[PDB]
Amino acid sequence: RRNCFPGDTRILVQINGTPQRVTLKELYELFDEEHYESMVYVRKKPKVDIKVYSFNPEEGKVVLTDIEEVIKAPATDHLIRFELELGSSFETTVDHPVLVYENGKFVEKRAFEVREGNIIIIIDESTLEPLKVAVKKIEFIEPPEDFVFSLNAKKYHTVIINENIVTHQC
Amino acid sequence: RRNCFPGDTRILVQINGTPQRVTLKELYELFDEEHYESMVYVRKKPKVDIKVYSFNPEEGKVVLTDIEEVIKAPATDHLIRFELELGSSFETTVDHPVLVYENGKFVEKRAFEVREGNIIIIIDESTLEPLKVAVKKIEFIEPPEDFVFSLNAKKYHTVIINENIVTHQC
Amino acid sequence: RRNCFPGDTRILVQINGTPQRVTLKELYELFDEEHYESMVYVRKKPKVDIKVYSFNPEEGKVVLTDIEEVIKAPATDHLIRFELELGSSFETTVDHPVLVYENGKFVEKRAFEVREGNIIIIIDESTLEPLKVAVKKIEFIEPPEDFVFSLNAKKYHTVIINENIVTHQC
Amino acid sequence: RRNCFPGDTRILVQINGTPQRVTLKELYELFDEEHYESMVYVRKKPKVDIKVYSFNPEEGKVVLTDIEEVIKAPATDHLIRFELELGSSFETTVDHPVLVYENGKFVEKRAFEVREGNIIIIIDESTLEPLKVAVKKIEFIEPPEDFVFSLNAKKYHTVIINENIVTHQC
Amino acid sequence: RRNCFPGDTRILVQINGTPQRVTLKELYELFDEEHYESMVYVRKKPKVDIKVYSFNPEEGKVVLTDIEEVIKAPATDHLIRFELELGSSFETTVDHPVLVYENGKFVEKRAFEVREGNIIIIIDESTLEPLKVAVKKIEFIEPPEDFVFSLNAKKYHTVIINENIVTHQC
Amino acid sequence: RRNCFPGDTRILVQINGTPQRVTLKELYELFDEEHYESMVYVRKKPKVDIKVYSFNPEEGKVVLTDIEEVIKAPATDHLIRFELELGSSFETTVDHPVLVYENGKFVEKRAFEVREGNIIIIIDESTLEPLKVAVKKIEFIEPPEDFVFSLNAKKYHTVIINENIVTHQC
């Protein structure tokens, strides 16, 4: 019954009697009592009357089933996020080279080595001039698009995405 | 000078004197004389006066350089696309199980084994009833989001994405 | 009790009282009631009195045991098969370049892009002249040599291949 | 011009004026002056007048070209070969368990740990009795079927296999 | 409860009432009744009163628990060890080139092909002269530093390494 | 001429006329003019008269050659280092669970989510009591043992490690 879905995939459920299509990230945020088990986040208690629409291939009938667990698997690796002055942002890999101004020179610096206060070269969208801006904040971030969600349901483990009956999206 | 970019990444160029931001898929479709070399598609002749904006870190100056080649690398694996009756579509992996109606039974069939004329079970978005629809067309497709583009430029190999000076997006 | 065997590996069994060596592909085709479960084909009902010869290392005795399931795992990726005129065939990878004649030119075309009616260049075995033949049929095929079989037996999970007692061939 | 071929693949060449189809293992054994360079065996001097048949797609003509190097890449990992008494052989992986008789017990022993003089249990093909045989010889062997060959030719790098014009078999 | 630890990692246990820090290799060698199961060595019977110190996060208390199994996983691949004359040793990979003297020539030979009696070139640490020494012994060895150990404990599966409460070291 | 060596591997060189064995990390720190090129750190200017001892297999003679570049390749992934109060340290993977005290509860927290000021549970080596200590510092660190060094030398690319003539240690 193990499956993988992107965060933005919409599946069809019944909450408080009415049916609708919720994104799997929303379905996760519709549970609580989070627990970091193994290498994933498991949520087992719902805070709204939840049921997932599945299919019974023995009787060939659309059916309701219980959402036992909702699972959120963090990204494998993470990116580095430089919040710079003048509002500009820069997300990149830890090994990607960043153009830095130091000691009157333009040098290529491994993103992992950039520190707050360092000068990044950016290029103004209006004037197309090289601008010297400072790194205000450095954050190791996991892009929501890199998360993998799973759904453990009782008995009937298939899920209804748009019009289709899908088992997983690994 | 080898790099990787998604198809939808916008880089800044000068065409016929004016500068603007074009997607790398557009930049590819702005060349011609295609050639399948090694395992990639190379386009070397431009049909519009093209130059890419890069950066000179010796003088610290934004500069124009020539786009020698634009490269398009096909997806690794491909998906199967079922065009069904009533307008519905279904894209999936060759090994994903598809709910099929055959011999009065609902069976799980490997997508690779589905044939035209087979009956797929779908679920109507309005009525939530199981519908029996027929496979009209079967296509092995490569999603545009799975293509990897590259840019070979002369001397200065960096590229200006929004405000940032990036080397690649591998 | 999970194992892997090529299709052509011969193991020793007793069918209808007599013992003999059957290939694992034959052993699979000696069952029925196929089911595509997970990502493999499982056959659980035998159509002939079947037992597999295994070994009891506690008493050190050759023994008979029941064949619960026979499993067939499809190839990972598949090849493209071009059936050409004049009887010639061509099996290759989806990314391998095929010599095509189009618009009076010999071009290298990604096998994935070849279509029925396209002209392939072949070389006659007798005369060694380049011949222009047409693609009559295009098939995505899985070579039997790429399939991986498994055997689930009761209690004693080893198998007798020629003279040897082997556990698997992963 | 880098390619990969199995040892048993037949390509078409001209030796001493006459054309014929030789296996790539034979083509390798038709050269000498072996050299272990990088992680492969290179042979550069031919001991017979050799030329390989290739294709000129500019003029669309079958052509002769020079075989600069023939390359033989050893298998990645190797197997263990037990030569046992009574003529029986056993090839397996270093981690596969071998049924051994020691101290009056049948034990599963990692193939890597088996030594000469150890007792292997085999099963006679005629009588189907368990036989105790001794390991006479232990050899770390590389199966010929696991070798990967390459051909470096001048200018025209394609090769004629049966009727087809193929670039590689990676 | 599955974990991985290097051989030299020290965990804290109580043997015969007194607590101390033992290396996981020592902890393995403190059990017996070895069994090669799957692809690992399992030891289940202790020859000394053993208990492992774990943590109870419900009561937040350091606790004793039973060591059910201790597991030792062999290295993936192995090295070749040349015992040479004059006491010198040489450990290397099966594919690494070894400088050999044969037929009055210095040749690079694949380590896998070196045989006993072959002449290796070494360089004396005192005089810095090239010395011709003979291969006396050839051994396929698994470096202790390449082994991966595991601990199966009852209920509480965490382990106390120095001052820290760690789950694994995969 | 591309090779890989651990940081602690000692190779034999001549500095200012005298020969000795320096670790490759020391050899790197004996150069300067660092440059982050591709995904590695290259040092090309020596600050001490350097030459590396290599071997000439044509004349069979130990020889001196020039060290063109010394290369340092950063670790693939990095660890998280928690500097805690009372002097204790904790290095772990970003996904490893850390025992945290929050809201009067002992919870398992993904190391990536631990913040400064959080309470870690450790276990005193003397008293074996659980101690509540605070995270003072959080550092993303690359262990020196995870770095891979390379040496580009002129003509003769082999290196003398102890008594042996080795090409690489990939």
mmCIF file of N, CA and C in Angstrom, chain B residues 63-131:
data_model
loop_
_atom_site.group_PDB
_atom_site.id
_atom_site.type_symbol
_atom_site.label_atom_id
_atom_site.label_comp_id
_atom_site.label_asym_id
_atom_site.label_seq_id
_atom_site.Cartn_x
_atom_site.Cartn_y
_atom_site.Cartn_z
ATOM 1 N N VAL B 63 28.499 41.735 -20.720
ATOM 2 C CA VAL B 63 29.027 41.659 -22.078
ATOM 3 C C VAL B 63 28.119 40.794 -22.949
ATOM 4 N N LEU B 64 28.222 41.000 -24.263
ATOM 5 C CA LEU B 64 27.566 40.169 -25.268
ATOM 6 C C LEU B 64 28.509 39.090 -25.779
ATOM 7 N N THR B 65 27.978 37.882 -25.967
ATOM 8 C CA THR B 65 28.784 36.833 -26.570
ATOM 9 C C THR B 65 27.929 35.992 -27.508
ATOM 10 N N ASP B 66 28.627 35.242 -28.358
ATOM 11 C CA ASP B 66 27.995 34.492 -29.431
ATOM 12 C C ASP B 66 27.492 33.146 -28.935
ATOM 13 N N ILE B 67 26.304 32.772 -29.405
ATOM 14 C CA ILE B 67 25.697 31.483 -29.095
ATOM 15 C C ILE B 67 26.150 30.501 -30.171
ATOM 16 N N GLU B 68 27.173 29.700 -29.865
ATOM 17 C CA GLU B 68 27.681 28.757 -30.855
ATOM 18 C C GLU B 68 26.674 27.639 -31.113
ATOM 19 N N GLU B 69 26.297 26.908 -30.067
ATOM 20 C CA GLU B 69 25.352 25.809 -30.186
ATOM 21 C C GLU B 69 24.274 25.931 -29.122
ATOM 22 N N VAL B 70 23.086 25.427 -29.442
ATOM 23 C CA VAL B 70 22.037 25.198 -28.455
ATOM 24 C C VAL B 70 21.678 23.719 -28.499
ATOM 25 N N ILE B 71 21.608 23.095 -27.330
ATOM 26 C CA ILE B 71 21.527 21.647 -27.216
ATOM 27 C C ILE B 71 20.254 21.274 -26.472
ATOM 28 N N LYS B 72 19.632 20.179 -26.903
ATOM 29 C CA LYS B 72 18.402 19.670 -26.312
ATOM 30 C C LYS B 72 18.591 18.183 -26.070
ATOM 31 N N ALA B 73 18.546 17.776 -24.801
ATOM 32 C CA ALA B 73 18.772 16.382 -24.448
ATOM 33 C C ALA B 73 17.444 15.723 -24.130
ATOM 34 N N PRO B 74 17.064 14.669 -24.847
ATOM 35 C CA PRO B 74 15.762 14.040 -24.604
ATOM 36 C C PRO B 74 15.681 13.442 -23.209
ATOM 37 N N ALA B 75 14.443 13.263 -22.754
ATOM 38 C CA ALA B 75 14.192 12.623 -21.473
ATOM 39 C C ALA B 75 14.846 11.246 -21.422
ATOM 40 N N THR B 76 15.134 10.788 -20.206
ATOM 41 C CA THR B 76 15.735 9.472 -20.029
ATOM 42 C C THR B 76 14.754 8.377 -20.437
ATOM 43 N N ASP B 77 13.666 8.226 -19.691
ATOM 44 C CA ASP B 77 12.586 7.320 -20.044
ATOM 45 C C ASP B 77 11.365 8.128 -20.457
ATOM 46 N N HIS B 78 10.372 7.426 -20.990
ATOM 47 C CA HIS B 78 9.182 8.057 -21.533
ATOM 48 C C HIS B 78 7.939 7.489 -20.863
ATOM 49 N N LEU B 79 6.832 8.203 -21.009
ATOM 50 C CA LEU B 79 5.560 7.754 -20.471
ATOM 51 C C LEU B 79 4.670 7.221 -21.582
ATOM 52 N N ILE B 80 3.632 6.507 -21.168
ATOM 53 C CA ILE B 80 2.596 6.028 -22.063
ATOM 54 C C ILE B 80 1.386 6.936 -21.893
ATOM 55 N N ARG B 81 0.823 7.382 -23.013
ATOM 56 C CA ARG B 81 -0.332 8.268 -23.053
ATOM 57 C C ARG B 81 -1.490 7.525 -23.706
ATOM 58 N N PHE B 82 -2.571 7.357 -22.951
ATOM 59 C CA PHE B 82 -3.814 6.768 -23.426
ATOM 60 C C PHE B 82 -4.795 7.901 -23.706
ATOM 61 N N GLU B 83 -5.133 8.086 -24.976
ATOM 62 C CA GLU B 83 -6.235 8.952 -25.369
ATOM 63 C C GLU B 83 -7.488 8.089 -25.403
ATOM 64 N N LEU B 84 -8.424 8.388 -24.506
ATOM 65 C CA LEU B 84 -9.650 7.631 -24.314
ATOM 66 C C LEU B 84 -10.841 8.384 -24.899
ATOM 67 N N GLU B 85 -11.957 7.675 -25.037
ATOM 68 C CA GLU B 85 -13.155 8.326 -25.534
ATOM 69 C C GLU B 85 -13.726 9.233 -24.451
ATOM 70 N N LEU B 86 -14.640 10.113 -24.867
ATOM 71 C CA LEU B 86 -15.225 11.157 -24.028
ATOM 72 C C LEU B 86 -14.217 12.250 -23.683
ATOM 73 N N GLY B 87 -13.110 12.327 -24.426
ATOM 74 C CA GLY B 87 -12.127 13.377 -24.255
ATOM 75 C C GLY B 87 -11.080 13.146 -23.186
ATOM 76 N N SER B 88 -11.238 12.134 -22.335
ATOM 77 C CA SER B 88 -10.323 11.946 -21.215
ATOM 78 C C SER B 88 -8.959 11.448 -21.683
ATOM 79 N N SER B 89 -7.922 11.864 -20.958
ATOM 80 C CA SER B 89 -6.547 11.464 -21.208
ATOM 81 C C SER B 89 -5.991 10.753 -19.979
ATOM 82 N N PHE B 90 -4.911 9.997 -20.180
ATOM 83 C CA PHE B 90 -4.254 9.316 -19.063
ATOM 84 C C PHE B 90 -2.786 9.118 -19.407
ATOM 85 N N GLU B 91 -1.893 9.795 -18.691
ATOM 86 C CA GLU B 91 -0.457 9.604 -18.855
ATOM 87 C C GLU B 91 0.077 8.861 -17.641
ATOM 88 N N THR B 92 0.907 7.850 -17.882
ATOM 89 C CA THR B 92 1.393 7.019 -16.787
ATOM 90 C C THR B 92 2.695 6.350 -17.213
ATOM 91 N N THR B 93 3.281 5.592 -16.291
ATOM 92 C CA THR B 93 4.498 4.854 -16.588
ATOM 93 C C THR B 93 4.158 3.512 -17.227
ATOM 94 N N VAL B 94 5.126 2.970 -17.971
ATOM 95 C CA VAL B 94 4.906 1.722 -18.688
ATOM 96 C C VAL B 94 4.589 0.572 -17.743
ATOM 97 N N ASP B 95 5.006 0.662 -16.482
ATOM 98 C CA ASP B 95 4.808 -0.415 -15.523
ATOM 99 C C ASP B 95 3.655 -0.159 -14.558
ATOM 100 N N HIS B 96 3.024 1.006 -14.626
ATOM 101 C CA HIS B 96 1.934 1.317 -13.712
ATOM 102 C C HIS B 96 0.691 0.505 -14.081
ATOM 103 N N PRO B 97 -0.051 0.001 -13.094
ATOM 104 C CA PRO B 97 -1.241 -0.806 -13.403
ATOM 105 C C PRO B 97 -2.439 0.072 -13.754
ATOM 106 N N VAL B 98 -3.130 -0.301 -14.828
ATOM 107 C CA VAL B 98 -4.314 0.387 -15.322
ATOM 108 C C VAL B 98 -5.517 -0.515 -15.090
ATOM 109 N N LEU B 99 -6.586 0.055 -14.547
ATOM 110 C CA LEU B 99 -7.818 -0.697 -14.349
ATOM 111 C C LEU B 99 -8.514 -0.909 -15.684
ATOM 112 N N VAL B 100 -8.661 -2.169 -16.076
ATOM 113 C CA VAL B 100 -9.201 -2.550 -17.370
ATOM 114 C C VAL B 100 -10.426 -3.421 -17.134
ATOM 115 N N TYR B 101 -11.426 -3.280 -17.997
ATOM 116 C CA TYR B 101 -12.585 -4.164 -18.001
ATOM 117 C C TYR B 101 -12.439 -5.139 -19.159
ATOM 118 N N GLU B 102 -12.310 -6.422 -18.843
ATOM 119 C CA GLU B 102 -12.239 -7.433 -19.883
ATOM 120 C C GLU B 102 -12.876 -8.712 -19.367
ATOM 121 N N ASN B 103 -13.619 -9.385 -20.248
ATOM 122 C CA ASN B 103 -14.315 -10.629 -19.915
ATOM 123 C C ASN B 103 -15.204 -10.455 -18.687
ATOM 124 N N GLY B 104 -15.926 -9.337 -18.641
ATOM 125 C CA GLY B 104 -16.799 -9.052 -17.522
ATOM 126 C C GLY B 104 -16.108 -8.864 -16.191
ATOM 127 N N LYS B 105 -14.785 -8.699 -16.177
ATOM 128 C CA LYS B 105 -14.031 -8.554 -14.943
ATOM 129 C C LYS B 105 -13.227 -7.261 -14.959
ATOM 130 N N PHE B 106 -13.055 -6.683 -13.772
ATOM 131 C CA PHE B 106 -12.113 -5.593 -13.561
ATOM 132 C C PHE B 106 -10.761 -6.191 -13.185
ATOM 133 N N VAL B 107 -9.762 -5.986 -14.037
ATOM 134 C CA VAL B 107 -8.425 -6.520 -13.820
ATOM 135 C C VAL B 107 -7.412 -5.383 -13.850
ATOM 136 N N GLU B 108 -6.312 -5.577 -13.130
ATOM 137 C CA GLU B 108 -5.190 -4.654 -13.192
ATOM 138 C C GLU B 108 -4.251 -5.123 -14.296
ATOM 139 N N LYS B 109 -3.987 -4.247 -15.258
ATOM 140 C CA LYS B 109 -3.193 -4.584 -16.425
ATOM 141 C C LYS B 109 -1.988 -3.662 -16.475
ATOM 142 N N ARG B 110 -0.816 -4.229 -16.725
ATOM 143 C CA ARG B 110 0.363 -3.404 -16.931
ATOM 144 C C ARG B 110 0.132 -2.452 -18.101
ATOM 145 N N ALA B 111 0.346 -1.156 -17.854
ATOM 146 C CA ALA B 111 0.123 -0.142 -18.883
ATOM 147 C C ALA B 111 0.776 -0.521 -20.204
ATOM 148 N N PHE B 112 1.954 -1.140 -20.138
ATOM 149 C CA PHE B 112 2.653 -1.560 -21.346
ATOM 150 C C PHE B 112 1.820 -2.531 -22.176
ATOM 151 N N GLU B 113 0.930 -3.290 -21.537
ATOM 152 C CA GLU B 113 0.141 -4.299 -22.234
ATOM 153 C C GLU B 113 -1.202 -3.783 -22.734
ATOM 154 N N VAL B 114 -1.605 -2.566 -22.359
ATOM 155 C CA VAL B 114 -2.887 -2.039 -22.809
ATOM 156 C C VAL B 114 -2.838 -1.807 -24.314
ATOM 157 N N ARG B 115 -3.938 -2.119 -24.997
ATOM 158 C CA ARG B 115 -4.036 -1.966 -26.441
ATOM 159 C C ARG B 115 -5.224 -1.082 -26.794
ATOM 160 N N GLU B 116 -5.198 -0.541 -28.010
ATOM 161 C CA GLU B 116 -6.330 0.234 -28.502
ATOM 162 C C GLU B 116 -7.577 -0.641 -28.562
ATOM 163 N N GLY B 117 -8.713 -0.066 -28.179
ATOM 164 C CA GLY B 117 -9.936 -0.813 -28.035
ATOM 165 C C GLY B 117 -10.183 -1.368 -26.648
ATOM 166 N N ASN B 118 -9.138 -1.512 -25.828
ATOM 167 C CA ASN B 118 -9.322 -1.922 -24.442
ATOM 168 C C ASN B 118 -10.218 -0.931 -23.708
ATOM 169 N N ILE B 119 -10.906 -1.428 -22.683
ATOM 170 C CA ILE B 119 -11.801 -0.626 -21.857
ATOM 171 C C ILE B 119 -11.068 -0.244 -20.576
ATOM 172 N N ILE B 120 -10.901 1.059 -20.362
ATOM 173 C CA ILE B 120 -10.397 1.629 -19.118
ATOM 174 C C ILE B 120 -11.581 2.074 -18.272
ATOM 175 N N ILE B 121 -11.465 1.879 -16.962
ATOM 176 C CA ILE B 121 -12.415 2.428 -16.006
ATOM 177 C C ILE B 121 -11.939 3.820 -15.611
ATOM 178 N N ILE B 122 -12.796 4.820 -15.806
ATOM 179 C CA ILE B 122 -12.532 6.151 -15.267
ATOM 180 C C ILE B 122 -13.677 6.525 -14.342
ATOM 181 N N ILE B 123 -13.596 7.689 -13.708
ATOM 182 C CA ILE B 123 -14.628 8.113 -12.774
ATOM 183 C C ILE B 123 -15.042 9.533 -13.124
ATOM 184 N N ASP B 124 -16.297 9.686 -13.556
ATOM 185 C CA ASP B 124 -16.826 10.975 -13.985
ATOM 186 C C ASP B 124 -16.711 12.010 -12.873
ATOM 187 N N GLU B 125 -16.194 13.189 -13.225
ATOM 188 C CA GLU B 125 -15.994 14.232 -12.228
ATOM 189 C C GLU B 125 -17.317 14.770 -11.688
ATOM 190 N N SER B 126 -18.377 14.767 -12.501
ATOM 191 C CA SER B 126 -19.665 15.274 -12.037
ATOM 192 C C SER B 126 -20.377 14.255 -11.151
ATOM 193 N N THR B 127 -20.675 13.078 -11.701
ATOM 194 C CA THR B 127 -21.523 12.103 -11.030
ATOM 195 C C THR B 127 -20.768 11.167 -10.101
ATOM 196 N N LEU B 128 -19.444 11.081 -10.231
ATOM 197 C CA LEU B 128 -18.629 10.153 -9.448
ATOM 198 C C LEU B 128 -19.027 8.699 -9.702
ATOM 199 N N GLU B 129 -19.567 8.401 -10.933
ATOM 200 C CA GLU B 129 -19.837 7.019 -11.301
ATOM 201 C C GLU B 129 -18.656 6.433 -12.062
ATOM 202 N N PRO B 130 -18.398 5.136 -11.910
ATOM 203 C CA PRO B 130 -17.408 4.487 -12.779
ATOM 204 C C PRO B 130 -17.938 4.391 -14.205
ATOM 205 N N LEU B 131 -17.127 4.855 -15.149
ATOM 206 C CA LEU B 131 -17.447 4.877 -16.567
ATOM 207 C C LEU B 131 -16.510 3.937 -17.310
#
